[PDB]
Write an enzyme that holds these catalytic residues in place. Structure first.
Site, PDB file in Angstrom:
ATOM      1  N   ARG A  37      -8.626  -1.043  -4.247  1.00 43.40           N
ATOM      2  CA  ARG A  37      -7.603  -0.813  -3.753  1.00 43.40           C
ATOM      3  C   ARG A  37      -6.375  -1.969  -3.556  1.00 43.40           C
ATOM      4  O   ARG A  37      -6.511  -2.488  -2.348  1.00 43.40           O
ATOM      5  CB  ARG A  37      -8.199  -0.119  -2.012  1.00 43.40           C
ATOM      6  CG  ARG A  37      -7.016   0.727  -1.339  1.00 43.40           C
ATOM      7  CD  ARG A  37      -7.114   1.003  -0.216  1.00 43.40           C
ATOM      8  NE  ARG A  37      -5.973   2.168   0.898  1.00 43.40           N
ATOM      9  CZ  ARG A  37      -5.381   1.375   0.958  1.00 43.40           C
ATOM     10  NH1 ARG A  37      -5.441   0.212   2.150  1.00 43.40           N
ATOM     11  NH2 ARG A  37      -4.879   1.756   2.362  1.00 43.40           N
ATOM     12  N   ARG A  43      10.280  -5.498  -0.749  1.00 48.59           N
ATOM     13  CA  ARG A  43       9.305  -5.496  -1.559  1.00 48.59           C
ATOM     14  C   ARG A  43       9.702  -7.275  -0.638  1.00 48.59           C
ATOM     15  O   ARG A  43       7.909  -8.387  -0.957  1.00 48.59           O
ATOM     16  CB  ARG A  43       9.319  -5.781  -2.679  1.00 48.59           C
ATOM     17  CG  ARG A  43       8.590  -5.165  -3.614  1.00 48.59           C
ATOM     18  CD  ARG A  43       9.375  -2.992  -3.559  1.00 48.59           C
ATOM     19  NE  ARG A  43       9.147  -2.440  -4.223  1.00 48.59           N
ATOM     20  CZ  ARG A  43       9.299  -1.769  -5.430  1.00 48.59           C
ATOM     21  NH1 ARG A  43      10.866  -3.261  -5.733  1.00 48.59           N
ATOM     22  NH2 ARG A  43       9.132  -0.521  -6.350  1.00 48.59           N
ATOM     23  N   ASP A  87       4.978 -12.531   4.622  1.00 51.87           N
ATOM     24  CA  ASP A  87       5.233 -11.914   2.928  1.00 51.87           C
ATOM     25  C   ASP A  87       5.266 -12.395   2.222  1.00 51.87           C
ATOM     26  O   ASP A  87       5.436 -14.381   2.482  1.00 51.87           O
ATOM     27  CB  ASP A  87       6.137 -11.157   2.964  1.00 51.87           C
ATOM     28  CG  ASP A  87       6.660 -10.215   2.045  1.00 51.87           C
ATOM     29  OD1 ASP A  87       5.339  -9.178   2.531  1.00 51.87           O
ATOM     30  OD2 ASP A  87       7.363  -9.681   0.755  1.00 51.87           O
ATOM     31  N   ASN A 122      -7.080   9.591   5.341  1.00 50.01           N
ATOM     32  CA  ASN A 122      -7.487   8.451   4.906  1.00 50.01           C
ATOM     33  C   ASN A 122      -7.539   7.648   7.077  1.00 50.01           C
ATOM     34  O   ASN A 122      -6.528   8.034   7.458  1.00 50.01           O
ATOM     35  CB  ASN A 122      -6.452   7.456   4.233  1.00 50.01           C
ATOM     36  CG  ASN A 122      -5.462   7.091   4.824  1.00 50.01           C
ATOM     37  OD1 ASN A 122      -4.955   7.645   5.999  1.00 50.01           O
ATOM     38  ND2 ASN A 122      -4.599   6.109   4.619  1.00 50.01           N
ATOM     39  N   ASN A 143      -0.799  -8.315   0.139  1.00 50.95           N
ATOM     40  CA  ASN A 143       0.712  -8.148  -0.349  1.00 50.95           C
ATOM     41  C   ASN A 143       1.353  -9.478   1.052  1.00 50.95           C
ATOM     42  O   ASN A 143       2.189  -9.498   1.790  1.00 50.95           O
ATOM     43  CB  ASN A 143       1.551  -6.995   0.417  1.00 50.95           C
ATOM     44  CG  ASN A 143       2.974  -7.052   1.066  1.00 50.95           C
ATOM     45  OD1 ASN A 143       3.901  -7.583   0.017  1.00 50.95           O
ATOM     46  ND2 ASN A 143       3.599  -6.734   2.636  1.00 50.95           N
ATOM     47  N   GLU A 186      -1.994   1.394  -3.107  1.00 48.79           N
ATOM     48  CA  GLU A 186      -1.490   2.389  -1.882  1.00 48.79           C
ATOM     49  C   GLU A 186      -0.173   2.218  -2.161  1.00 48.79           C
ATOM     50  O   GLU A 186       0.859   1.222  -1.594  1.00 48.79           O
ATOM     51  CB  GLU A 186      -2.236   1.383  -1.018  1.00 48.79           C
ATOM     52  CG  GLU A 186      -2.595   2.956   0.346  1.00 48.79           C
ATOM     53  CD  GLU A 186      -1.820   2.176   1.503  1.00 48.79           C
ATOM     54  OE1 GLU A 186      -1.303   0.611   1.318  1.00 48.79           O
ATOM     55  OE2 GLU A 186      -1.700   2.164   3.048  1.00 48.79           O
ATOM     56  N   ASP A 245      -3.383  -2.788  -1.139  1.00 44.13           N
ATOM     57  CA  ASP A 245      -3.319  -2.482   0.170  1.00 44.13           C
ATOM     58  C   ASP A 245      -1.475  -2.860  -0.111  1.00 44.13           C
ATOM     59  O   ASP A 245      -1.100  -3.472  -0.835  1.00 44.13           O
ATOM     60  CB  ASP A 245      -4.198  -3.360   1.147  1.00 44.13           C
ATOM     61  CG  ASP A 245      -2.826  -2.796   2.931  1.00 44.13           C
ATOM     62  OD1 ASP A 245      -3.426  -1.804   3.320  1.00 44.13           O
ATOM     63  OD2 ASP A 245      -2.353  -3.482   3.020  1.00 44.13           O
ATOM     64  N   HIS A 273       5.091  -2.457  -0.987  1.00 42.61           N
ATOM     65  CA  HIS A 273       5.830  -3.719  -0.182  1.00 42.61           C
ATOM     66  C   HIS A 273       5.662  -4.418  -1.514  1.00 42.61           C
ATOM     67  O   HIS A 273       6.144  -5.874  -1.545  1.00 42.61           O
ATOM     68  CB  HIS A 273       5.174  -4.194   0.143  1.00 42.61           C
ATOM     69  CG  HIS A 273       5.785  -2.535   1.249  1.00 42.61           C
ATOM     70  ND1 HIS A 273       6.524  -2.517   1.825  1.00 42.61           N
ATOM     71  CD2 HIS A 273       4.886  -1.460   2.226  1.00 42.61           C
ATOM     72  CE1 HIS A 273       6.381  -1.532   2.960  1.00 42.61           C
ATOM     73  NE2 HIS A 273       5.101  -1.017   2.911  1.00 42.61           N
TER      74      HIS A 273
HETATM   75 CA   LIG Z   1       6.578  -7.693  -0.093  1.00 42.03          CA
END
Ligand SMILES: [Ca+2]
Length: 496
Positions: free
Chosen positions: A195, A158, A167, A298, A100, A233, A197, A201
């Site tokens: 996974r 996002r 980002d 976790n 991400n 996630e 992550d 987002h």
């Molecule tokens: Ca993002």
């Protein structure tokens, strides 16, 4: 995407948090394979920023510099060696994919990375990928700080920086391609899944576009047409615009409500009691079982760095922790993931641990190897919960009753409950402030069974408690409220 791709008979994965590749390879052959573990989730294997203030914190690995398999856990050759050795013994490897974002925008430019790669967050220059200013969402984000300020706004969550992390513009085919190139390299090496992550987002569509360019699992270990296992996630606790179901098309999702609610119940908080677990599962508002990845704790929320906060149970609360993990492993809901951590010098300043950043056991930055004590426990500050008899034996319990239905439930209206799984296993819990002494129907064939919580079955012998099931599947159970482990578990493979 939804299938773990584990060997038939293996129903759990272990998160060997911050372990070195060479130690995981050895663990696969010396313990995980023979003890029935299905797979291992590893820390991000790609190059990250080396943070010296604080000093080599655990979260520095969530700040990518490049996609080179070069970290404190080891290099590419060591990573490849681990995947091969583990797959050869039937233990799969799942990679924590940080796609991400890159590193913090406020991080200084230079070569302070796990592989010496040069990078400049200020100019959005990551030449080792390569990435440039044209590959970030600096222009997409419309917040003043440039970071996420409103979680009630899906778009900023996002397109804006999560706590300052650069980002990436995942809608760009170039970026999607660079990420798929990294993931395909890992797939070819032999990993069985990923996974995802910080999936919350990323747009569900952007993730899909990336998964579209991935190869099928290595045909040397997996059947042709095999797709990598995908679990995203997503922290969804209830009243947010973004919902877990928005990601069902890409694969499974992490159910963060599972551990939060279980912790509250085991602790007997907010008026909860174990008697309410009769309808545990989707009945509690959780996502469908076939789309869930469950866990008690976790690496994030075990330090208070995540969803659940204070009700979360971890190794620090060993007695209640073993009970919670035991219940999770015995219950048929979702795919279970067990945590394996390390000890750190906890220091609280009014309800907050100032040492929650502390990285893995190390010698001036060099991660200490995992040593095995004569009693099969770990040294060098590694907790190794997966090696605890009560946890490891419950991992095996889940494998044995794989497929059997939830039945023969019993409860005293308080915190004393029991239930079986078809005719392959039975578990009893005493979380009340008084002794438990009752004859219950186990639905198990008559015979002598070894309690796998207090001991083990060794060639027609039990090293702990023995349970006698009569012809009508009835057996007597006595658990004092002061017992070290207030629960008993027996199954088809623990019978003498
Ligand atoms: Ca993002």
């Amino acid at each position: 995407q939804y299938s773990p791709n584990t060997q038939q008979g293996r129903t759990s994965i272990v998160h060997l948090f911050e372990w070195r590749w060479v130690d995981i390879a050895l663990e696969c052959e010396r313990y995980l394979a023979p003890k029935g573990f299905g797979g291992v989730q590893v820390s991000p294997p790609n190059e990250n920023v080396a943070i010296y203030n604080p000093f080599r914190p655990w979260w520095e690995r969530y700040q990518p510099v490049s996609y080179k398999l070069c970290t404190r856990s080891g290099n590419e050759d060591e990573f490849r060696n681990m995947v091969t050795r583990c797959n050869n013994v039937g233990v799969r490897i799942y990679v924590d994919a940080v796609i991400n974002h890159m590193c913090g925008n406020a991080v200084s430019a230079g070569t302070s990375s796990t592989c010496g790669s040069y990078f400049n967050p200020g100019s959005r220059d990551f030449p080792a990928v390569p990435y440039s200013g044209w590959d970030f969402n600096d222009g997409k984000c419309k917040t003043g700080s440039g970071d996420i300020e409103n979680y009630n706004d899906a778009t900023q969550v996002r397109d804006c920086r999560l706590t300052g992390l650069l980002d990436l513009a995942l809608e760009k085919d170039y970026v999607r391609s660079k990420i798929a190139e990294y993931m395909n390299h890992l797939i070819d090496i032999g990993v069985a899944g990923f996974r995802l992550d910080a999936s919350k987002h990323m747009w569900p569509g952007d993730i899909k576009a990336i998964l579209d360019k991935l190869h099928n699992l290595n045909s040397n270990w997996f059947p042709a047409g095999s797709k990598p296992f995908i679990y995203q996630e997503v922290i969804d606790l209830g009243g947010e615009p973004i919902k877990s179901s928005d990601y069902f098309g890409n694969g499974r999702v992490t159910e963060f409500k599972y551990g939060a609610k279980l912790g509250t119940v085991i602790r007997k908080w907010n008026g909860e009691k174990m008697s309410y677990l009769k309808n545990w599962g989707e009945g509690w508002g959780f996502v469908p079982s076939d789309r869930a990845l469950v866990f008690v704790d976790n690496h994030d929320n075990q330090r208070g760095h995540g969803a659940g906060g204070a009700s979360i149970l971890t190794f620090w609360d060993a007695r209640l922790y073993k009970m919670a993990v035991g219940f999770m492993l015995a219950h048929p809901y979702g795919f279970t993931a067990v945590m394996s951590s390390y000890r750190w010098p906890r220091q609280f300043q009014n309800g907050n641990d100032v040492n929650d950043w502390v990285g893995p056991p190390n010698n001036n930055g060099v991660i200490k190897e995992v040593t095995i004590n004569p009693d099969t426990t770990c040294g060098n500050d590694w907790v190794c919960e997966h090696r605890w008899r009560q946890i490891r034996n419950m991992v095996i319990f889940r494998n044995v009753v794989d497929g059997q239905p939830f039945t023969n439930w019993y409860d005293n209206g308080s915190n004393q409950v029991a239930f079986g799984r078809g005719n392959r296993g039975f578990i009893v819990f005493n979380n009340d402030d008084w002794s438990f002494s009752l004859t219950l129907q186990t639905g198990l064939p008559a015979g002598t069974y070894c309690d796998v919580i207090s001991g083990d079955k060794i060639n027609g012998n039990c090293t702990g408690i023995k349970i006698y099931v009569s012809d009508d599947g009835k057996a007597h159970f006595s658990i004092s409220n002061s017992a070290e482990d207030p629960f008993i578990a027996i199954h088809a493979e623990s019978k003498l």
